[PDB]
Write a structure and sequence with these properties.
Chain B: The modification Phosphoserine is found at residue 17. The complex is a heterodimer. Chain A is of the alpha+beta class. Helix content of chain A is 45%, strand content 14%. Chain A has one domain (4-168): PF0523-like (2-Layer Sandwich), CATH 3.30.2380.10. Chain A has helices at 27-36, 52-68, 76-84, 90-97, 117-122, 134-137, 140-147, 151-155, 159-169, and strands at residues 4-7, 15-22, 42-44, 106-112, 127-129. In chain A, strand 1 (4-7) and strand 2 (15-22) form a beta hairpin. Chain B is an alpha+beta fold. In chain B, helix 4 packs across helix 6 (198-211) and helix 5 crosses helix 7 (215-228). The N and C termini of chain B lie far apart (48 Å). The chains are: A alpha+beta, B alpha+beta. The A-B interface holds A 6, 8-11, 53, 56-57, 60-61, 64, 67-69, 150, 152-153, 155-157, 161-162, 164-166, 168-169, 171-173 and B 1, 4-5, 7-8, 11-12, 15, 34-38, 65, 68-69, 71-72, 75-80, 83-88, 90, 95, 97. The structure holds the ligand C[C@@]1(N2C(=O)c3cccc(O)c3C2=O)CCC(=O)NC1=O. Residues 22-23, 30, 32, 41, 82, 96, 98-102, 152, 165-166 of chain B line the site of ligand DO0.
């Protein structure tokens, strides 16, 4: 149990917080609450996250378009999730990178520029863990499938590198 | 929309003012620092006051877009180049991985010529550049501004890990003439910057010709472009 927080370098008054949970029993209810907005924040599938940098890049771009009023989706919480996908199909991105009712691991990401974190955590029927546990949750075969990563890309860099390059340029084709 | 756009450009200016300026060309300033915990370079295509502002915004956007697209193309094709972290189209800033501890091919060649006093030991370097640029052209990627300063050697230096940079003038073309011009530009930059290293460029051309699947029409166009100038 321990959060990870990072300031956004381009938006220095903004702090991004990551919370990781395992053995979650109520992913369906959590999904409904985030949809209704009662739970403030992005509920993300941790099995396809290879490094917090992936989250922070998605968050930076989301806040950027939030402040410009040019988000592709309707809320900052969905925009963060959408930015993780390599594709521009919104419903697919939210299905693949958001949580579904059967999931037992969940990552919560929120941004402040103040939320009662204890109450947020109490809503999860599960056990919070350090983000140092993320690599044990990540499923590399699912990551390579969603991002369509090739051996060619892995020969000149990391999987994270290829993921980020895809995330960051999908908006200019 | 104007207020929010102005605020974003001011945010960008503030962020750049915290970075180290490391390079400046005709059209771009390159700054270095950290971006969300990773070593990063941010390239700002900056306007010149004496040109028409509408044209400058278009030009800055176009070169930012083309470089981002080229870098994605390189990575998916297995051509070593910086990965893109973030593209800010409000400010024409491109956020990129830093190639840490690297040296330009230009500096490496010049240091060699200074110490060894002969280019014989640079044929391996030339052969590597030939393989890299053959792969780039075979993906129909024209760099547009080839010099020995737009190629980096990533540590450890003696492994000859070439990284291509600065694709703002790049474009996609299958035309051998465009590839011949790309090589002709490299040749003139190379011979003028590195006098009396002709055996190095000869070894580059030999390796490019072997490595590229379609070099024959390209090298014929190189001869034609040389003659015309
Ligand atoms: C100056 C240098 N560098 C990059 O890493 C880099 C990446 C992308 C574009 C680009 O123009 C550059 C560039 O000039 C290289 C030497 C070093 O150690 N650090 C740098 O910042």
């Amino acid at each position: 149990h321990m959060q990870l927080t990072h300031q956004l370098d381009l938006f220095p008054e903004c702090r991004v917080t990551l919370l990781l949970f395992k053995d979650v029993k109520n992913a369906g209810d959590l999904r409904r609450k985030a949809m209704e907005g009662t739970i403030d924040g992005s509920l993300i599938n941790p099995t396809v996250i290879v490094d917090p940098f992936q989250i922070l890049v998605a968050a930076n771009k989301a806040v950027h378009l939030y402040k410009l009023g040019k988000m592709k989706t309707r809320t900052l919480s969905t925009e963060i999730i959408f930015n993780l996908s390599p594709n521009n199909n919104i419903s697919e991105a939210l299905k693949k990178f958001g949580i579904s009712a059967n999931d037992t691991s969940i990552l919560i990401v929120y941004i402040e520029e103040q939320i009662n974190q204890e109450y947020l955590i109490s809503q999860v029927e599960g056990h919070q863990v350090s983000l140092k546990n993320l690599p044990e949750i990540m499923n590399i075969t699912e990551v390579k499938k969603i991002y369509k990563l090739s051996s060619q890309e892995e020969s000149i860099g990391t999987l994270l590198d290829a993921i980020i390059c895809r995330m960051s340029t999908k908006d200019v084709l | 929309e104007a207020e929010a756009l102005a605020a974003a450009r001011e945010r960008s200016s503030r962020f750049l003012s915290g970075l180290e300026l490391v390079k400046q060309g005709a059209e771009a300033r390159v700054f270095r620092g950290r971006f969300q915990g990773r070593a990063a370079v941010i390239k700002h295509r900056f306007p010149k006051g004496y040109r028409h502002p509408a044209l400058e915004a278009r030009l800055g956007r176009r070169r930012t877009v083309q470089e981002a697209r080229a870098l994605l193309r390189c990575r998916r094709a297995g051509i070593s180049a910086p990965v893109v972290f973030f593209v800010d189209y409000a400010s024409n800033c491109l956020y990129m991985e830093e190639i840490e501890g690297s040296v330009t091919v230009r500096d490496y060649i010049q240091s060699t010529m200074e110490t060894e006093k002969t280019p014989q030991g640079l044929s391996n370097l030339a052969k590597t550049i030939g393989q890299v640029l053959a792969r780039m052209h075979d993906e129909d990627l024209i760099h547009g501004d080839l010099t020995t300063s737009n190629m980096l050697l990533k540590p450890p230096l003696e492994q000859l890990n070439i990284v291509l940079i600065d694709f703002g003038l790049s474009f996609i073309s299958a035309l051998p003439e465009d590839k011949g011009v790309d090589l002709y530009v490299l040749e003139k930059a190379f011979l003028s910057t590195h006098p009396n290293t002709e055996t190095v460029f000869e070894a580059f051309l030999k390796s490019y010709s072997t490595s590229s699947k379609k070099a024959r029409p390209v090298l014929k166009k190189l001869d034609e472009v040389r003659l015309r100038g």
